Amino acid sequence: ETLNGGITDMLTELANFEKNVSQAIHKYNAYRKAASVIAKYPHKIKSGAEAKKLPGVGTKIAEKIDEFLATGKLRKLEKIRQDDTSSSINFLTRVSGIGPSAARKFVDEGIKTLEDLRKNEDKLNHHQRIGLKYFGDFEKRIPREEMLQMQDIVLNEVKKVDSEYIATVCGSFRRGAESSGDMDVLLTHPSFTSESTKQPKLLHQVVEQLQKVHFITDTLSKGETKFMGVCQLPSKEYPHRRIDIRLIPKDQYYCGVLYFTGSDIFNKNMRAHALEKGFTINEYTIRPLGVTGVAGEPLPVDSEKDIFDYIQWKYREPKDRSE
DNA sequence: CCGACGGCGCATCAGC
DNA sequence: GCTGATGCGC
DNA sequence: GTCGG
Numbered sequence: 127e128t129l130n131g132g133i134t135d136m137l138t139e140l141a142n143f144e145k146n147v148s149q150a151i152h153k154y155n156a157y158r159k160a161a162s163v164i165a166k167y168p169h170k171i172k173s174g175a176e177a178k179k180l181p182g183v184g185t186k187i188a189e190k191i192d193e194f195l196a197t198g199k200l201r202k203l204e205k206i207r208q209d210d211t212s213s214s215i216n217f218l219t220r221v222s223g224i225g226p227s228a229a230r231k232f233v234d235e236g237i238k239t240l241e242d243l244r245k246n247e248d249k250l251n252h253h254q255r256i257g258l259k260y261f262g263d264f265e266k267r268i269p270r271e272e273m274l275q276m277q278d279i280v281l282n283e284v285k286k287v288d289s290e291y292i293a294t295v296c297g298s299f300r301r302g303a304e305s306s307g308d309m310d311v312l313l314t315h316p317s318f319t320s321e322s323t324k325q326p327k328l329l330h331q332v333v334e335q336l337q338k339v340h341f342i343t344d345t346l347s348k349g350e351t352k353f354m355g356v357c358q359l360p361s362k363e364y365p366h367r368r369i370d371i372r373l374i375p376k377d378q379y380y381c382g383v384l385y386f387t388g389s390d391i392f393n394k395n396m397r398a399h400a401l402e403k404g405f406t407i408n409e410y411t412i413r414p415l416g417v418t419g420v421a422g423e424p425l426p427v428d429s430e431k432d433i434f435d436y437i438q439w440k441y442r443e444p445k446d447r448s449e
Numbered sequence: 450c451c452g453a454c455g456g457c458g459c460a461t462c463a464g465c
Numbered sequence: 466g467c468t469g470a471t472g473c474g475c
Numbered sequence: 476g477t478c479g480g
């Protein structure tokens with residue numbers, strides 16, 4: 127399969143266990159970070175001591191890598207795999223809206239399967255019912271050809287509402303992925319900027335038009351700057367797809383498109399590197415950290431590249447932000 | 450030893 | 466009613 | 476779980 131695939135699968139399994147079963151989010155993030163650095167390491171790891179040189183691999187992961195390399199398994203993961211209760215909780219978190227807390231609450235009350243959830247819809251919130259309704263569709267990848275049909279509809283329909291909107295498809299699509307988990311749309315309008323005195327009421331109008339033409343079929347969440355929902359290409363029916371729309375102040379487009387292009391791991395790595403250089407980056411601003419350790423005033427951003435320059439990173443094209 | 454760990458929008462929960 | 470914490474996801 | 480202070 128892959129160089130060190132044994133080790134990174136083992137760390138991913140541990141990560142998922144800590145997140146889904148232990149609800150130990152720091153251990154989850156630790157395992158995820160080690161899995162990522164090892165997956166990038168361009169050599170066959172022969173010992174835990176070799177892995178321990180990598181940033182994010184410590185004593186405990188070195189010891190697991192030693193057990194895994196010597197035995198071809200981890201007894202801890204043997205046991206977790208034996209554990210029906212860990213398995214039920216892991217499975218239920220695959221429903222959109224079910225996290226570790228809901229999954230444990232359900233398994234505690236004997237609700238372990240998709241069938242058990244369908245029998246107990248009164249115990250689900252809206253997001254979970256939609257996640258359940260489209261469980262299969264939401265795990266199917268969107269071929270780039272369909273992403274292009276979807277982009278055509280979104281850009282066409284947004285222009286119908288107001289010719290001044292600019293819609294940009296972000297996420298894996300903007301990084302040039304041949305398939306995407308979902309569709310991420312960044313939206314700007316000239317009347318919505320960082321200096322706007324009142325809450326924008328723009329997103330509702332775009333969501334309404336996409337609902338009116340039956341492209342958007344369901345709503346998971348809706349506020350003034352974020353919509354999360356479900357959409358479907360018109361036709362055998364196409365699968366229902368997740369769609370996220372983010373309305374970002376027009377003058378903060380560079381920070382917005384950097385965030386919304388990802389990847390998630392790239393973003394986490396870039397923001398961590400910013401912190402070590404004395405900056406904090408969010409979807410809106412890059413701010414310097416002062417002596418008191420707190421974010422100062424937003425810095426001028428006149429390009430996507432300016433953000434990289436502040437933290438002294440070589441510019442990466444969207445295609446080079448994947449994992 | 451210690452606290453930090455990327456940063457945030459929305460829905461729901463929990464408590465006054 | 467309200468405000469803030471937690472859950473979940475981007 | 477790992478790191479930096």
Ligand SMILES: Nc1ccn([C@H]2C[C@H](O)[C@@H](COP(=O)(O)OP(=O)(O)OP(=O)(O)O)O2)c(=O)n1
Nearest residue numbers: 297298306307308385386387388389390393475
């Ligand atoms: N934990 C996360 C998740 C996401 N994002 C940002 C970067 C992502 O690229 C973007 C959209 O999130 P998705 O989960 O849709 O990620 P992708 O579009 O990269 O992947 P996929 O093909 O799974 O949709 O949001 C982030 O900063 N942190």
Ligand SMILES: *CC[C@H](OP(*)(=O)O)[C@H](O)COP(=O)(O)O
Nearest residue numbers: 140144150153186187190202476
């Ligand atoms: C992988 C080994 C673990 O590292 P972490 O601090 O999760 C622990 O050493 C296992 O110890 P336990 O929590 O006592 O099982």
Ligand SMILES: [Ca+2]
Nearest residue numbers: 178179180183
């Ligand atoms: Ca190390």
Ligand SMILES: [Ca+2]
Nearest residue numbers: 219221222224
């Ligand atoms: Ca889930």
Ligand SMILES: [Ca+2]
Nearest residue numbers: 297298308310
């Ligand atoms: Ca995406």
Ligand SMILES: [Cl-]
Nearest residue numbers: 150151152153
């Ligand atoms: Cl933890």
Ligand SMILES: [Cl-]
Nearest residue numbers: 151152155454
């Ligand atoms: Cl963490």
Ligand code: NA
Nearest residue numbers: 156159160182
């Ligand atoms: Na780590």
Ligand code: NA
Nearest residue numbers: 308309310370
């Ligand atoms: Na998304």
